[PDB]
Design a protein around this ligand. Structure first.
Ligand SMILES: Nc1ncnc2c1ncn2[C@@H]1O[C@H](COP(=O)(O)OP(=O)(O)O)[C@@H](O)[C@H]1O
Ligand code: BEF
Ligand SMILES: [Mg+2]
Length: 731
């Protein structure tokens, strides 16, 4: 096991194989330097085989498809991504699955229109791996397959899911324009322009700075593009999931509120700024509590200009844009209302109340009364009761959240109205969720986000491993099952009867229950569950062993957040608005007054995720796995421990194994024969269809290792299908 200076070796250390070089070998000491800059020293006598092994020559600053790898260990997989990342190749295939490592910098030529053009005219595998090749293959599947397609993008907060989604949309929008024979109706619709302009609007209203991402998505998005038989986008539909409405009124230290507030304050002209009584973001409680009002990566004034342009494309009138500006200004002033205790909560600093009442079209005495008192009618006289200061603050904040959430819903409705079109043929759906996040302090918001990420990982495992191997078994293929990391029991802990969501919902329906009584119930029921953590010291927390790591959640605020109560006194007040825009938002809204069962945030979200997964189940999926190379948002900094952790927990190692050994493409015998009949013209074919399929497959892969015949289908590897598709097009 002796290797001379400069020899390339795999060094087994710290539970992995390190790509390394022999630095020195003298006086019975051997020093290895890893490609990651770690230096490991040993007594030469202690080095044996398997501990140190020679590395396979070159093979050669990486491989494009990791199913091509001979060494399948985590060290080999990560080294391939590292070699490629160092030369700005952030994309690697695993069959048709795409790995994307966030470069945290622009890369010359990578997303230029000349590159988009090049990918549109090639087959998957002909060019270097790229998100444009996946978008193109997905698009080609609308004529190669019989179903709708979907692209699902996974990753922690900051991994690159939102950037990936926008790149796919830009590529499809460009390709939609290449389509023939483009009618004047379809050329003048500007529907692709509107679809692309939906992103700056939704990011301004739904994204915010967090520790993991200066542009974190605080809602989930599913974008459906309806494509005609001729290949042109006819229109689309956007579905939003669980906006983080509590961000409007409170943020963690160092975070910001939604981008749009800072854009509005930096972007409005002096006249409109004075009309809405607006000053700097520091002047507003809803924007100043976190201690951060700016970020060097964001020009808030430039974002405002971008939002204005996008809203014009989206057919928001100039008056509608002003109404949205006025509502946001009203919310900012509302947040500055302070209360003192005399009775009874009383408004202290009356200026903010007067400004907010004017901007919201409310009478100031009516707004003061609604925030400081509760009303009830008893056959048939009104009985006014004082609220305390915490109840007045909760009322002020619920008003701010309701205004923002209804305004966001209206914005999404307007986008959907603009991009609405025919659905005559097929669709491509793209899922952009909020990513996995584990902060210093996690609340109900992180619980819901991490649950959605857990659900998406279960969806990835179901398609890549579970349904895939079940199909091989049902078809009678020669196959040895590949084990995978199954997160099913974590979802069972969250979703089953007596599970986390069930207990949270049950406690929410009890008026006397508190976050403290909820925690006692969570601990009592689940202390022995392997996926649940009862903290030894942190008295306000519970933990969940998520697929992406253990997360501790502070229970404080869970019941109030889950109930999501809105006082009928405030709903009645909003309906008094003289500002038609505000009245229109609350005109037909259902009552959510405290009860003395109504859907909760958890019950509606569980239903929305189950409905989403059902939509995705009917489509053919493409998977993109975004990987963060480091936790410092740095370019050219591949932190191997951070990368390896994501590769391992996400099941990338087993994914390479199943894509390498398995057969991801399948067609019934007659379907295969009818599709590729042109490629069989020089073959002496037998009478039976199974024999006809075998003759073509043996011609294109004589090793007989890239395909198998099942009971009803031909099964083949993606590399063989790409080889057959390229030749079919040529003929
Ligand atoms: N492909 C990319 N090229 C360059 N920078 C990128 C790329 N993907 C992401 N980034 C950088 O990382 C940041 C976070 O990416 P984003 O897509 O918002 O993450 P996620 O949606 O997964 O939370 C971006 O705002 C940008 O600075
Ligand atoms: F912060 Be990312 F949108 F997950
Ligand atoms: Mg995002």
């Amino acid at each position: 096991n002796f290797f001379t200076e400069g020899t390339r070796v795999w060094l087994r250390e710290n539970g992995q194989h390190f790509p390394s070089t022999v630095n020195s070998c003298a006086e019975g000491i051997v020093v290895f330097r890893t490609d990651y800059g770690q230096v490991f020293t040993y007594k030469q006598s202690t080095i044996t085989h398997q501990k140190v092994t020679a590395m396979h020559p070159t093979n050669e600053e990486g491989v494009d498809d990791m199913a091509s790898l001979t060494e399948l260990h985590g060290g080999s997989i990560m080294y391939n991504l590292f070699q490629r990342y160092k030369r700005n190749q952030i994309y690697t295939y695993i069959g048709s699955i795409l790995a994307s490592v966030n470069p945290y910098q622009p890369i010359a030529g990578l997303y230029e229109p000349a590159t988009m053009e090049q990918y549109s005219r090639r087959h998957l595998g002909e060019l270097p791996p790229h998100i444009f090749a996946i978008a193109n293959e997905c698009y080609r599947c609308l004529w190669k397959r019989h179903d709708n397609q979907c692209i699902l993008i996974s990753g922690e907060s900051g991994a690159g899911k939102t950037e990936s989604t926008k790149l796919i949309l830009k590529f499809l929008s460009v390709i939609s324009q290449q389509s023939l024979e483009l009618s004047l109706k379809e050329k003048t619709s500007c529907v692709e322009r509107a679809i692309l302009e939906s992103s700056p609007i939704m990011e301004a209203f739904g994204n915010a700075k967090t520790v993991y991402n200066n542009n974190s998505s605080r809602f989930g998005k599913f974008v459906q593009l309806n494509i005609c038989q001729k290949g042109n986008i006819q229109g689309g539909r956007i579905v939003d999931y669980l906006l983080e409405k509590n961000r409007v009124v409170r943020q963690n230290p160092g975070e910001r509120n939604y981008h749009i507030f800072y854009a509005l304050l930096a972007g409005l002209e002096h006249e409109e700024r004075e009309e809405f009584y607006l000053s700097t973001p520091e002047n507003y409680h809803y924007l100043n509590q976190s201690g951060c009002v700016e970020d060097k990566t964001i020009s808030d004034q430039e974002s405002f200009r971008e939002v204005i342009t996008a809203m014009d494309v989206m057919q928001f009138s100039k008056e509608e844009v002003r109404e949205v500006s006025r509502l946001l200004a009203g919310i900012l002033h509302l947040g500055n209302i302070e209360f003192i205790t005399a009775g009874g909560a009383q408004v202290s600093f009356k200026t903010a109340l007067g400004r907010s009442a004017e901007l919201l079209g409310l009478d100031p005495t009516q707004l003061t009364d609604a925030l400081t008192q509760r009303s009830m009618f008893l056959r048939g006289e009104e009985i006014l009761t004082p609220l305390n200061v915490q109840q007045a603050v909760d009322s002020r904040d619920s008003l701010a959240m309701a205004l923002y959430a209804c305004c966001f819903e209206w914005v999404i409705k307007k986008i959907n109205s603009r991009i609405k079109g025919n659905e005559d043929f097929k669709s491509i759906g793209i899922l952009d969720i909020f990513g996995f996040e584990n902060f210093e302090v996690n609340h109900f918001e992180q619980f819901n986000i991490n649950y959605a990420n857990e659900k998406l990982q279960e969806y990835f495992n179901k398609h890549i491993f579970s349904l895939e191997q079940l199909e091989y078994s049902r078809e009678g293929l020669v196959w040895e099952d590949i084990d995978w990391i199954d997160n099913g029991e974590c979802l069972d802990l969250i979703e089953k009867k007596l599970g986390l969501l069930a207990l949270i919902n049950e406690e929410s329906h009890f008026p006397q229950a508190t976050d403290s009584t909820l925690l006692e119930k969570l601990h009592s029921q689940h202390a022995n569950n392997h996926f649940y953590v009862k903290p030894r010291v942190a008295v306000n927390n519970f933990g969940v062993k998520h697929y992406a790591g253990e997360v501790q959640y502070d229970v404080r605020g869970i019941l109030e957040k889950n109930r999501d109560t809105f006082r009928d006194d405030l709903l009645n007040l909003l309906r008094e608005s003289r500002f038609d825009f505000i009245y229109d938002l609350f005109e037909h809204v259902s009552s959510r007054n405290n009860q003395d069962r109504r859907p909760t945030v958890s019950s509606q979200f569980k239903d929305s995720l189950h409905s989403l997964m059902a939509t995705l189940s009917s489509s053919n999926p493409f998977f993109v796995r975004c990987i963060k190379p480091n936790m410092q948002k740095m370019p050219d900094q591949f932190d191997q421990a951070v990368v390896l952790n994501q590769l391992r927990y996400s099941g990338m190692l087993e994914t390479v194994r199943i894509r390498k050994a398995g057969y991801a493409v399948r067609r019934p015998f007659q379907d295969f024969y009818k599709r590729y009949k042109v490629l069989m013209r020089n073959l002496a074919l037998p009478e039976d269809v199974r024999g006809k399929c075998t003759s073509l497959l043996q011609l294109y892969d004589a090793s007989n290792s890239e395909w198998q015949l099942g009971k009803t289908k031909v099964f083949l590897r993606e590399s063989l299908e790409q080889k057959l598709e390229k030749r079919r097009e040529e003929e």
